[PDB]
Design a protein around this ligand. Sequence first.
Ligand SMILES: *[C@@H]1O[C@H](CO)[C@@H](O[C@@H]2O[C@H](CO)[C@@H](O[C@@H]3O[C@H](CO[C@H]4O[C@H](CO)[C@@H](O)[C@H](O[C@H]5O[C@H](CO)[C@@H](O)[C@H](O)[C@@H]5O[C@H]5O[C@H](CO)[C@@H](O)[C@H](O)[C@@H]5O)[C@@H]4O)[C@@H](O)[C@H](O[C@H]4O[C@H](CO)[C@@H](O)[C@H](O)[C@@H]4O[C@H]4O[C@H](CO)[C@@H](O)[C@H](O)[C@@H]4O)[C@@H]3O)[C@H](O)[C@H]2NC(C)=O)[C@H](O)[C@H]1NC(C)=O
Ligand SMILES: NC(=O)[C@@H]1CCN1C(=O)COc1cccc2nsnc12
Ligand SMILES: [Ca+2]
Ligand SMILES: [Ca+2]
Ligand SMILES: [K+]
Ligand code: NA
Ligand SMILES: [Zn+2]
Length: 805
Amino acid sequence: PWTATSGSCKGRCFELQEVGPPDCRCDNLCKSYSSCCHDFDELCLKTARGWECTKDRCGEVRNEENACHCSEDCLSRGDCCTNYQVVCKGESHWVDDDCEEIKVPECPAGFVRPPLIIFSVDGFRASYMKKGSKVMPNIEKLRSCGTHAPYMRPVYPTKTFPNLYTLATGLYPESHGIVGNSMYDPVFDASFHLRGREKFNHRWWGGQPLWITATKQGVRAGTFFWSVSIPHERRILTILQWLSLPDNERPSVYAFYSEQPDFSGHKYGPFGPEMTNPLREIDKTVGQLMDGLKQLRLHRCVNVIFVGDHGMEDVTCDRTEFLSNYLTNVDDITLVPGTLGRIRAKSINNSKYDPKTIIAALTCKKPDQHFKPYMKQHLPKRLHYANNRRIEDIHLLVDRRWHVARKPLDVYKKCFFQGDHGFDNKVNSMQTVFVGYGPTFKYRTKVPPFENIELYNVMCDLLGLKPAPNNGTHGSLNHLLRTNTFRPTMPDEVSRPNYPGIMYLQSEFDLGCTCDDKVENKLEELNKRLHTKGSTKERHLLYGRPAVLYRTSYDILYHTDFESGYSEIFLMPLWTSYTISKQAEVSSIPEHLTNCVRPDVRVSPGFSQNCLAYKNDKQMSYGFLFPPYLSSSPEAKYDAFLVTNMVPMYPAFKRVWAYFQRVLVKKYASERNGVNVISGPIFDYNYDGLRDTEDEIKQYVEGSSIPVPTHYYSIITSCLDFTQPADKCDGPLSVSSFILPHRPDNDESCNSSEDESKWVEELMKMHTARVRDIEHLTGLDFYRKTSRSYSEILTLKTYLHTYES
Ligand SMILES: *[C@@H]1O[C@H](CO)[C@@H](O[C@@H]2O[C@H](CO)[C@@H](O[C@@H]3O[C@H](CO[C@H]4O[C@H](CO)[C@@H](O)[C@H](O[C@H]5O[C@H](CO)[C@@H](O)[C@H](O)[C@@H]5O[C@H]5O[C@H](CO)[C@@H](O)[C@H](O)[C@@H]5O)[C@@H]4O)[C@@H](O)[C@H](O[C@H]4O[C@H](CO)[C@@H](O)[C@H](O)[C@@H]4O[C@H]4O[C@H](CO)[C@@H](O)[C@H](O)[C@@H]4O)[C@@H]3O)[C@H](O)[C@H]2NC(C)=O)[C@H](O)[C@H]1NC(C)=O
Ligand SMILES: NC(=O)[C@@H]1CCN1C(=O)COc1cccc2nsnc12
Ligand SMILES: [Ca+2]
Ligand SMILES: [Ca+2]
Ligand SMILES: [K+]
Ligand code: NA
Ligand SMILES: [Zn+2]
């Protein structure tokens, strides 16, 4: 675009409404667009005499050339140096004052709501709060007096633009569209990059960021972006001047952004000796804001959020893997490189390109290989990184401390750097910070770690806004807040279950199944009837039946050892619930029952699986959701071979599933003092993170209507106080969950030729999940009947067990 830069910034410095080219701009982004009026530096970026009042400037004659003022009129003009009251009026720095609870907002007249200030710091690693604590007194006072988490989990990839835009929208990058710091959109045929002009185009930027949500609901917003050449002292002074505007003109929400400590972290590594100075400097900027707020009498009015986008790991040029050491055809691919890999064909005119051969050439080729290839639909579902045309089908998950590059020349026609980020968002070095301070946040409160996708909802709660639809779980962070909590109701159940009794004779079934189960006592005849009508259901279903939130046809089936919700549409359980006490015994499948499958006389032949389909399907076998190994008695074991408990399983997956059921469930019950397990299938053939309808299923057991799951889940719940058994717990719960990919090979696990005891648990840890992730993939709602507050249950449903030490 052309700009007539001969207009003037007189009286317009850091104006909030941006004017359209060809008119010249005076806003905090004009520099980045080469569009400022000729006099912007002169008028808007004054530097004379620097940023601090000195004793000799106190009561000076106003000089409009000064960067900031120490004259008597400065407080009414809103343009004092932040230290004016300290130097000139005997006041204390905010950091030197005792922490005093802010029970109510203490705001000047005309303030309709406590303003919100988001203070975002690039590359601020979680452990900086403890390791830098001696040189960050302002930050340590926000942290200790307010509400803090030990860390906040970013989104993947743990890069700047994806994380800042997730902070602004509450969306996963797959949904907001900023899926990396570099991208190719094949529909646009356009490329997005850090340097350059394409990234300004609005088409990259999906969802509804907080400043737009605010503006649409009548709440005014400061501009959230700052041109890199505007010094931090000037950003802070601009925020404080905006806070002196008249009521009708004054924003309610503001953002400050620091490029540090990321900028230095890339050069020196996360804990380089050079990193102390950048931490001191950020702390000094926080001190400037808080002193400025105290001058304006806003320091007990404003909610301040101190938040990072991601951490920083040790990474050097010598720890690079080269695709040229794996692929013959390296010139036929494009790689997006570094702390992740994304691969596509160099040319869409190349009908020679085959993803299968590239994946195979990159799979377990070298004993200490520092990346793992995936088709994007096979990535751990917790990453939510697939449902976007900008995310390449082929992905490389790079080990922490490493890079991937196409060939060696890429690394020295561009060592230098000692830090980088972008790795798996569960990696400890990638975690970042959260502090909330103000009237609306709690006083001196620690909260558990949480994900950055949750903050948009809370920022909306802080400003009285209705959030746009997002990936947060609204209410899961109510424990951060003194007031403005959001009081959600549980979703309504959409489908009520049937409770079938005995309706079918054995001879009505023609399923091609056999079982050696013909073995005839009137004591345990009343008992079996009691078990089938749900006499043990209180033991095995501890948190109520899951609610089905979509329209479907399903049956509740009771058994001595487990309860299921059996889908007449999918011909298998949606869910299977069972409790395993610390004392439970593991047993074998008796030799005579190895191939036993039994018709369920509560369920019609036409709503049943059949064994003939599994015999004819040479790729597919079957497993059971309730494990026969954990049967309470020889007689109860027959229930586990019901055709209503069977699910399709590739033999390679049955190795994983059998080890989980035979070894790991009992191990968890031993360690956690009992566990409640809910297991089931997931169908996500379009990798959108959402339950498939039946018309989206791409694979069936050959010759049948039996759909093949993409994944199997388990939710494993126990008492947070492990002195109480899982089935008699009086207080909060503890959960871990997974979503295992249902794959026909174990190529993901490079050690899979060894015994399951060396690789299966490591696979399961990689595919750790939130209960909320399973809710999206299944249309079920769990924990409907506990003694716990709903907000606490929402917090439990967002918990991720990360298995970092
Ligand atoms: C995380 O939270 C988010 C937000 O809540 C969840 O995402 C939502 O999920 C819904 C279902 O997947 C989805 O609703 C669909 O969207 C269509 C309307 O879309 C536009 O409008 C909204 C509102 O302003 C806007 O946000 C959208 O933004 C997307 O697209 C723009 C421009 O392309 C992007 O810049 C932006 O980043 C975003 O991209 C992301 O989402 C899209 C899908 O919209 C993906 O394709 C991208 O990869 C990326 O992830 C849009 O501008 C609506 O038209 C749909 O309705 C059809 O679907 C069914 C199925 O048959 C049918 O019954 C309907 O009547 C209709 O059918 C017809 O169209 C079909 C599809 O073309 C066609 O096949 C049929 O044959 C018919 O012709 C549908 O309602 C909603 O858009 C997104 N929103 C966002 C912001 O992403 C997300 O699910 C959560 N994640 C998890 C894991 O929980
Ligand atoms: N000028 C710049 O390019 C620097 C680098 C980030 N940026 C900022 O000034 C602050 O940046 C953001 C704040 C909120 C949402 C965002 N989505 S992507 N970047 C965002
Ligand atoms: Ca960053
Ligand atoms: Ca789906
Ligand atoms: K088979
Ligand atoms: Na393998
Ligand atoms: Zn960086």
